[PDB]
Amino acid sequence: MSSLLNSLLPEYFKPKTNLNINSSRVQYGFNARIDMQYEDDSGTRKGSRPNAFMSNTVAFIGNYEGIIVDDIPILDGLRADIFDTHGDLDMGLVEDALSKSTMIRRNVPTYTAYASELLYKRNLTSLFYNMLRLYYIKKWGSIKYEKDAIFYDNGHACLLNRQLFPKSRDASLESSLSLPEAEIAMLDPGLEFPEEDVPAILWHGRVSSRATCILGQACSEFAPLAPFSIAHYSPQLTRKLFVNAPAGIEPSSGRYTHEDVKDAITILVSANQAYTDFEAAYLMLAQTLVSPVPRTAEASAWFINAGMVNMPTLSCANGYYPALTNVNPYHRLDTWKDTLNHWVAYPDMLFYHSVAMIESCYVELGNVARVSDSDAINKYTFTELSVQGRPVMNRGIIVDLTLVAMRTGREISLPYPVSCGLTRTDALLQGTEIHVPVVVKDIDMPQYYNAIDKDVIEGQETVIKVKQLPPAMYPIYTYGINTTEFYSDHFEDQVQVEMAPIDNGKAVFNDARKFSKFMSIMRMMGNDVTATDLVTGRKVSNWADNSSGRFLYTDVKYEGQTAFLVDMDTVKARDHCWVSIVDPNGTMNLSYKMTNFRAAMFSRNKPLYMTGG
Amino acid sequence: MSSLLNSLLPEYFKPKTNLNINSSRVQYGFNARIDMQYEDDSGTRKGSRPNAFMSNTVAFIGNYEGLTSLFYNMLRLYYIKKWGSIKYEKDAIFYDNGHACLLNRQLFPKSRDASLESSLSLPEAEIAMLDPGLEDVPAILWHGRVSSRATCILGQACSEFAPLAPFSIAHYSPQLTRKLFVNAPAGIEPSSGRYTHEDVKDAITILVSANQAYTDFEAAYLMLAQTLVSPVPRTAEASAWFINAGMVLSCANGYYPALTNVNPYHLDTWKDTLNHWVAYPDMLFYHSVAMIESCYVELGNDLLVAMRTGREISTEIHVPVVVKDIDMPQYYNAIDKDVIEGQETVIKVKQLPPAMYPIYTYGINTTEYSDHFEDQVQNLSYKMTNFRAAMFSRNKPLYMTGGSVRTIATGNYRDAAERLRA
Amino acid sequence: MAPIDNGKAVFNDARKFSKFMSIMRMMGNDVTATDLVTGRKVSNWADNSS
């Protein structure tokens, strides 16, 4: 659905058609003007950063694995005459329709008997999904993946691509896949009895030399070398595929450009009258196009084990019954062609729709992981109460759309309750410890991170124990539309730290809420604060990120009693465009204001500009 | 966006069509009249400055690195041919106060002496014909037969730009494409080799009309307004901006011409920017000066223009310097505290000073710059009247030629009933 | 003063020069001005009583 994914984009964001991606990493964000202020008994110290960049790093890598599952049939496309008043295939009008057609008279009785099974095999979502992936593989084919590259680095802990993805050879996206071609046979109209477990599709005129090569590779096994997101592992959809084209199928060309795949899709949707099937395939790819680079080192727990993609079995019986498809189809919603028409016009807009969906999900799974099991709407039972339909199983797109509904705070409506796509909530529902690997840089690491060893020499491969999952992304596109006090994504905010002159700079934060806001605003002002917990004896640093530049409370990496000693004569000025706290006395009052917003994107440490219409 | 950048010019100034630029440096300002009145404890004194010239200096020198991208290069080819007699000398002055001096050897190493036409030697990309029947190469529509001259322009527009002299409209750009299909019913002619600046206008006007790429042109027009000219710094410290080099094609109309028909989807003022350029090409110079002034003024405190006008639009740096007088270390924050006339030293810049003073945007909104018309400083009370724009080029007056610019502009509605806000 | 000036201020008026130099001494700051015409120097710390 192009419509609901379009509304997620910000108001200030004015997108153009073409986006020239030339790398496997993009820093999308915005430039804002922050007017910071520090008030005290001595006096006020004002600062102003005219261009402050808040970013979320998004990559084209992510381990996924496809499995063939059984899903509901999509009945949109068939002629409106055969349907009854309620909206189900009234068999008796089918026998009437086949009799008054251009069919062979000896086949009518034998074909009508099979109709009861074959007419309820209508799901082309798997074919459109694979054909969409072939379009983007050939378009952005020049992107590279290096084996010994930096997946994450925060100074203390480093995580390489070798650690997360073993069995991985370095290669370009174009050179990753070597797809073998499936047989595309021509359907004989004078066949005695239809062959079930072999799908037959319709076509307009002659199947071109390039269309054979595309359909051949779409219905085949994806066995990748490099762990790319649009070239993940998928099983063999089918062995043979019939095509009811009176004009003969030309033999396989071998080569094809990305423009020839658009030609193949537009003919297939038009002939078969399968627009709702395409809408399902569009939302499936929107989830699994780009995966987020983790915000913190301990936020890599989401991407350790491979999340399963639910691809519905390829099943189509239009080739055997050409009469039942015509120019007057049955459809539920009137705006049923809108998703295809949007893709044909603006193909590259899917990148913006993809980041909008994953940013909406991973933000909400951040503040869903921080609720106790003893509650009404909790970790296990947040999907059931929200869903007001009849899906086969609460997985795939249903779990991702219900998280978007919670974020925006609106009612999302689909025509068919289809349950296909990636399932994200895997590591959450397990509710166990996850062991993420890390290579150390400094020697004073295991004070900050909950490491397995207490003394570790530099260049050693260690393990961090992550219990509660921290947020993987910070809200940027959904900034101050449905604000919560956890993220604290306000335009205006203030904090009042109360100290007396008798105290020699040392302040104890009994409250957890205002400790988070103090540590966050001090980082906007470019000050490196290092607090120490009095009960446990661990340490936390506000500089635990190089993208957003905010401090979330999950950076403590421990749930206990709140007694944070901060010494305010060890505050160090780190960044440029900063206000100085030389020597405070009395009550401190910090405050900021974000005034205007301008969309900005970065790639290879250079500006990435939007071009076209 | 013509109507946006046209608004930035002052209400009194209305420039003429043509402007014969014959140098790499242009002063622009106004001749105002100041009526001062002084009062203190000793007594009162009244005077009057009859003619006072307040001006900035803007140049065609700026180190930069690289269907909107195609129109961008086609526009750059137009101005290379038109103003293709501007000389860049390597051992010339960039800034000169009296104590310090910056040469063009410094700020621009890896440069030689060349004219603007002699800077680029562009190769030609293959312009092939798309035969109808074929079932990372763009295809564009065309009206009738592709002319012998039109081939050479499209060929050079797609090719790599590799300059010798640092010029603003000849900056380094990567190769757009290798091939470019043209769905022309009549076959294309082979490339001639030579073309006039007038022939590039004919190429742009046809390419936009056929493809209906009016909004793509508007993007390229604004994109060139930033690059076209660069500021000459106000003081020696304001050279810190221009040390590090600032960083600056797909179409499927040829394949599927059914998608582009007689009823296109569009603002109702979506053909104004092209209609403005095709009528008055030399007006871009004034729009460019207006834009780069607004940006570099507000950075002292791109679409910075909103912060300037106040309307809704829809590490220490090591500057290399030359010592002219022996007493230089007293004024500038120099590394070597003892110097000799001729020595090349380096000065330190921590906070970036303003590169330009408000001239066109003088008194539209006054900050405490203190660019008032009337002000009482505490006692000095002055009044500014009788503004008249004047431009100087190569220490002589540069006069505007041609006729008076008549307004072209379309209303918010043609025959549209309801404003579907969108 | 403007940011273009690197701390250096010239007092054309004699009245406000006297008030600046006096209030800076209440604040406990040792200012040393130099006359541009003659080339002599004046210090605000020229008394230990008032």
Cβ-defined contact of B250 to A209 (cutoff 8 Å):
no
Give me A98's structure tokens.
Answer: 């086949």
Burial, A188: exposed, middle or buried (Cβ in 10 Å; 0-12, 13-18, 19+)?
exposed
Contact B372, B13 (CB under 8 A): no
CA dihedral B228, A33, A295, A57 (to 10 degrees): -20
| Gyration radius from chain A CA atoms | 28
- Judge whether A136 and A24 are in contact, CB under 8 Å: no
Cα distance from B383 to chain A (closest Cα, Å)?
Answer: 34
DSSP summary character for residue A252: P
| Least Cα separation, residue A66 to chain B (angstroms) | 30
Give the HSE-up count for residue A444: Cα atoms under 13 Å, Cβ half-sphere: 4
CA distance B301 to A49: 11
Instruction: Tell me whether B315 touches chain A (CB under 8 Å).
Output: yes
DSSP A199: -
Q: Which residues pair with A533 in a beta bridge?
A: A564
- Residue C42 to residues A433, A556, C32, C48: CA-CA distances in angstroms? 75, 58, 6, 16
Find, among B282, B303, B167, the residue nearest to B227 by Cα. B167
Q: Quick one: chain C helix, strand, coil %, rounded to 5?
A: 25, 10, 65
Distance, CA of B393 to CA of B24 (rounded, Å) = 9
Does the CB of B73 have a partner CB in chain A at under 8 Å?
no
Q: How far apart are CA A602 and CA A53, in angstroms?
A: 10
List Cα–Cα distances, A415 to A75, A77, A277, A314, B222, in angstroms: 11, 13, 11, 20, 44
Tell me the two tokens of residue B39. Answer: 């009062």
Does C5 contact B at CB distance below 8 Å?
no
The dihedral sign for the CA sequence B355, B358, B360, B365: positive
Locus of tokens 């909406």:
A360
Q: Which of B315, B357, B316, B323 is nearest to B340 (CA)?
A: B323
Distance, CA of A270 to CA of A17 (rounded, Å): 24
C-beta of residue A439 within 8 angstroms of C-beta of residue A461: yes
> Is-contact C31 C24, C-beta < 8 A?
yes
Chain A residues in contact with B255 (beta carbon < 8 A): 259
Q: Do chains B and C touch (3 or more CB pairs under 8 A)?
A: yes
Rg of chain B in Å (alpha carbons)? 25
Q: In angstroms, rounded to a whole number, what is the distance separating the alpha carbons of residues A610 and A600? A: 10
Please give the Cα distance from B170 to B163 (Å, whole number): 6
User: What angle is formed at CA A193 by the lines to CA A187 and CA A196, rounded to 5 degrees?
Assistant: 75
Q: DSSP string covering A7-59, please?
A: HTS-SS----SB----SSEEEEEEEEEE--EEE-SS--EE--EEEEEEEEEEE
C4:B353 CB<8 A: yes
Residues in contact with A265: Cβ distance below 8 Å, sequence separation at least 6, in sequence order: A128, A131, A132, A135, A278
Produce one character per residue of B40-52: b if its CB has 16 or more CB atoms within 10 Å, e if not.
eeeeeeeeeeeee
CB contact under 8 A, B315 and A576: yes
CB B27 within 8 A of CB B57: yes
Q: Is residue A314 within 8 Å of A238, Cβ to Cβ?
A: yes
Angle between helix A397-408 and A350-368 (nearest 10): 80
Q: Which residues are CB-contacts of B16 (< 8 A; sequence separation ≥ 6)? A: B400, B401, B402, B403, B404, B405
Q: HEC profile for chain B?
A: CHHHHHHCCCCCCCCCCECCCCCCEEEEEEEEEECCEEECCCCEEECCEEEEEEEEEEECCCCEECCHHHHHHHHHHHHHHHCCCCEECCCCEEEECCCEEEECCCCCCCCCCEEHHHHCCCCCCECCECCCCCCCCCEEECCCCCCHHHHHHHHHHHCCECCCCCCHHHCEECCCCCECEEECCCCCCCCCCCCCHHHHHHHHHHHHHHHCCHHHHHHHHHHHHHHCCEECCCCHHHHHHHCCCEECCCCECCCCCCCCCCCCCCCCCCCHHHHHHHHCHHHHHHHHHHHHHHHHHHCCCCCCHHHHHCCCCCCCEEEEEEECCCCHHHHCCECCCCCCCCCEEEEEECCCCCCCCCCCCCCCCCCCCCCCCEEEECCEEEEEECCCEEEECCCCECCCECCCCCCCCCCCCCCCCCCCCC
Substitution target from C5, C6, C11, C18 for chain B, most B beta carbons within 10 A: C6
Burial annotation A362-379 (CB, 10 A radius, 16+ → b, else e) = bbbbbebbeeeeeeeeeb
Quote the Cα angle for A334-A337-A342, to 5°: 130
Tokens 């105002």 belong to which residue?
B32
- Is B267's Cβ below 8 Å from some Cβ in A? no
Tokens of A340: 């295809």
Residues A274, A232: contact at Cβ < 8 Å?
no
Instruction: Tell me how far apart the alpha carbons of residues B260 and B104 are, in angstroms, rounded to a whole number.
Output: 50
Distance of alpha carbon B237 from alpha carbon B78, whole angstroms? 35
Q: In angstroms, what CA-CA distances link A179 with A133, A208, A234, B154?
A: 13, 20, 11, 38
Across the interface, of B41, B235, B333, the residue whose CB is closest to C4 is B235
Q: Are A430 and A380 in contact (CB under 8 A)?
A: no
The secondary structure of A443-473, three-state, reads CCCCCCCCECCCCCCCCCEEEEEECCCCCCC
Burial of A339 (0-12, 13-18, 19+ CB in 10 A): buried
For residue C45, what are the CA distances in angstroms to A71, C25, C29, C32, C33? 92, 7, 9, 9, 11
- CA–CA dist B17, B277 (Å, integer): 11
* C-beta separation of A314 from A129 below 8 A: no
Under an 8 A CB cutoff, do C3 and B235 touch? no
Is C6 within 8 Å of chain B by CB? yes
SS (H, E, C) A281-348: HHHHHHHCCCEECCCCHHHHHHHCCCEEEEEECCEEECCCCHHHCCCCECCCCCCCCHHHHHHHHCHH
The candidate with the shortest Cα–Cα distance to B307, out of A51, A477, A525, is A51
CB contact under 8 A, B306 and A596: yes
Identify which of C3, C13, C15 has the shortest CB distance to residue B351. Answer: C3
- At residue A78, φ and ψ (nearest 5 deg) are -65, 150
CB–CB contact B40 C3 (8 Å): no
d(CA A144, CA A138): 13
* Residues from chain A contacting residue B250 (CB–CB below 8 Å): 17-18, 612
Rounded alpha-carbon distances, angstroms, from residue B402 to B16, B19, B133, B261 = 6, 8, 50, 39
Helix, strand or coil, per DSSP, at residue A175: coil
**Residue A22 is encoded by which pair of tokens?**
């030339």
Q: How far is CA A287 from CA A227, A284, B24, C33, in A?
A: 16, 6, 53, 70
Strand order from edge to edge, sheet including A64-69: A64-69, A307-312, A421-422
- Please report the resolution in angstroms: 10.0
Other chains touching C, judged by 3 or more CB pairs under 8 Å = B
Return the amino acid letter for A240.
K
- Dihedral sign of CA atoms A203, A209, A211, A212 in order: positive
**Long-range residue pairs from B103-106, CB within 8 A, at least 24 positions apart, any chain:** B103/B322, B104/B61, B106/B320, B106/B321, B106/B322, B106/B344
| Mutation target among B40, B235, B350 for the C interface, most CBs of C within 10 A | B40
Task: Give per-residue burial for A430-444: e unless 16+ CB within 10 Å, then b.
Answer: eeeebebebbbeeee
Chain B CB within 8 Å of residue A613 CB:
yes
* DSSP letters spanning A476-534: STTSSSS--TTTT--SEEEEEE---TTS-SEEEE--SHHHHHHHHHHHHTTEE-EEEES
Q: Measured between alpha carbons, how far is A303 from A152 in angstroms, rounded to an integer?
A: 13
CB of A428 closer than 8 Å to CB of A379: yes
**Under 8 Å between Cβ of B27 and B392:** yes
Name the residue among A542, A513, A547, A516 with its Cα closest to residue A529: A542
Q: Say how many C-beta atoms besides its own lie within 10 A of residue A508's C-beta.
A: 13
| Amino acid type, A439 | V
Q: Where are the beta strands (DSSP E) in A63-149?
A: 64-69, 122-123, 144-145
Q: Determine whether the interchain pair B235/C13 forms a contact, defined as Cβ–Cβ distance below 8 Å.
A: no
